[model samples]
Target: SQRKAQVRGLPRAKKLEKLGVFSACKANETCKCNGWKNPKPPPAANLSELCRSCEHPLADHVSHLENVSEDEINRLLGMVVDVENLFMSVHKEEDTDTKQVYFYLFKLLRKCILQMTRPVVEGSLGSPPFEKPNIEQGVLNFVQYKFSHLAPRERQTMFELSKMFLLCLNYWKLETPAQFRQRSQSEDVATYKVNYTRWLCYCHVPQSCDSLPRYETTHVFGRSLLRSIFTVTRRQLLEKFRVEKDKLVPEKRTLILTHFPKFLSMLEEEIYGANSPIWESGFTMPP
Candidate 1:
């Protein structure tokens, strides 16, 4: 039943991408609007209002999708509204369970845009309990076993903060595999270096300059990238929590000051250690 709902959502996502902010010029050979080389990119407030050439609004820039049926165009426009609604929902949501589901759907919509294909909740995302002692479970177990003496309120706060920490990890960007390989083994040859440059152009540079559509970190790279940055990110998060400790209430204070840092230290060991049991299905921590 849920899968049917997601299947229904695919076309809506596709339309959202095409007609959305990055929609470019519908050009004739006479005009230079072929790619998003919009000589004058508009302000965020006026993003879709004006074309690259001061010719007309960006709505007129759809010569590419022009061949499609009128019905489809209307459908695509309607999906754009829905996408805006979902984007807002993801932000307003506070309960992590519902927020996670909303976030999954949001990313599903985005993945369709990126691939120009029907969206499917691929691999471990749709399925739950994906890993034995997955990040969520590992953190929960760590709090339970190690900080069992803490009051229930403080324990709950730790779990809440842990979820937020893991969420940051989920969205964090890391270098591409080629980029990582190039950096570590510097023979100064230009084999993977070219693609590394492309990764920068296609992935990193677009964030500062909105001329290109954004490709997310996980989308462009893989686990190897995460491995390279995990230790550094963990340390950063630890320091950040320490710096922000004054803001949390007494219940939350102990969680961050004492328990959370230790949890990260223990978790880091599992993350970098070879053949760590935390990754194995049905694995249990030895007493």
Candidate 2:
């Protein structure tokens, strides 16, 4: 009503109306003389509501992740990015455990990241290629695949923050859907009792969780424990993991989820390690 009242009180509106502009368009007289224009929308004073639709102009559009301002990124993070705090907000369930939430959150975070950079990653496949700064962060865009660059740092952070959660999964007996239970029943899967606690053992340190940290034995030393489902050994952990290096399988496989926490550790060793290339190249300072 305020808008209409203002229009009604306008000198131009009155002048136009007096010129038969507001009258019937039966013969297209009003339309032809004054031109019926769509109403100019009221101002959007709220920053959050500005992009509710496509209200902004195409050329001046604020769409896309790269175009998103820092404030907006920080705001989005505020809503759903708190992981460690809620580690125990949930406990256990019939089929899965609360820890699975973090894994699901990882996938969701990746999906969100892809959504954030839709204009960049997917766009690159279409046109001249969405170019980057050719520097560290920018060079990271197509480093592995679409949305791969951010995963390292993100996984690194998630790993550190997940210390307690992983400990819960390991020591606290918070187990998720394991590999054996999902597949066709076999004695191989049945042999290892649910008492398996490699994760809790991984966190245990007689020395430190640092570069030269030491564990009990072959059971938890590096990555050897993955080789056999029978005994938990630490010495050959990394070698066992090294064997699984090129063992990529189709989406039908479950090793990814089964070893995700360890995989996260692997990522930290590669990207966030003391002499990681991420630091050597100076593309990232490796925080």
Candidate 3:
């Protein structure tokens, strides 16, 4: 009976009305706009709603900043580009050992930027109309919580921030399903749809969750685990690099340095700063 009802109601009444099914409803009655299985609504409206409903006055501030000066936007764009280049270069390395260290370090760097960018972006954006002080304070509180601990905080601040990040990430992920469906009719969109489906199935859905506690716990645990794994991996890579450093004919060494200068500098800083409690504890990388 349930399956029959679902099959019978598969098409939306609103869609039917557009198809000249005016007699399906009484005068002054409205169609529910519901369709089969009431498939998850497209998230584009929710994104716009979130942008509209955001309680941070920082949203306005960010807009004002964006309009007033191009410098800030330029700086952000530059950093984003540089990070992308770094990310790609790290992935391109052929050595498995070097790749492992690069992967972890890339994650660490990406995580730090993500944490730092939230407040910067929020502050730049300015708060929404009728913004609440608590909302702004909550964002600041989260920043403090995420960067303040080594190991895991007894109260778990990083966990909370990760939940907020995932919410925004999921919103972005759901923003274009319908558009994708329309485009999928063409080969161009079909290829994108294929990759997207793979990512959603293998990467996004398995990882995505609404549970704040679980999200936070996993984020914290994952970061801690990555830090430990990277530490061991880095030591091994350094040992190999040192032995091969002089022997790698000048051209090979040049290629290594050219491709990995930032990564090498980052590792050096990590090692030299190892004795410091903040670095040793893995509270965070250099801000």
When superposed on Cα atoms, how far off is each prediction in RMSD?
12.6, 22.9, 22.5
Return the TM-score for each candidate structure. Answer: 0.42, 0.17, 0.19
Question: What shift in Å separates residue 226 of candidate 2 from its native position after superposition?
Answer: 3.3
Which one is best on lDDT? Answer: 1
lDDT of each: 0.50, 0.31, 0.34
lDDT of 2 by residue, 1-287 (tens): 23333433444323232222111222222322111222236322222222223333212222232355544444333222222222323243334433444334333433443343211112111321112221223223223322244567654443443342233223322223264346425554433222123232223211221111223322232221222221122223444445764675643134433544454454445433354343232344334
Off by over 4 Å in 1: 1-158, 173-226, 284-287
The per-residue C-alpha lDDT of model 3 at residue 239 equals 65
State model 3's lDDT.
Answer: 0.34
Ranking by lDDT: 1, 3, 2
lDDT, residue 131, candidate 1? 24
Per-residue lDDT of candidate 3, residues 100-179 (tens digit): 43454344434433332411112221222211222223333334433456455522434443344334333334323344
Q: Number of backbone collisions per candidate, in order? A: 0, 15, 17
Kindly provide the TM-score of model 1 when superposed on the true structure, using C-alpha atoms.
0.42
| Angstrom error at residue 116, model 2 | 44
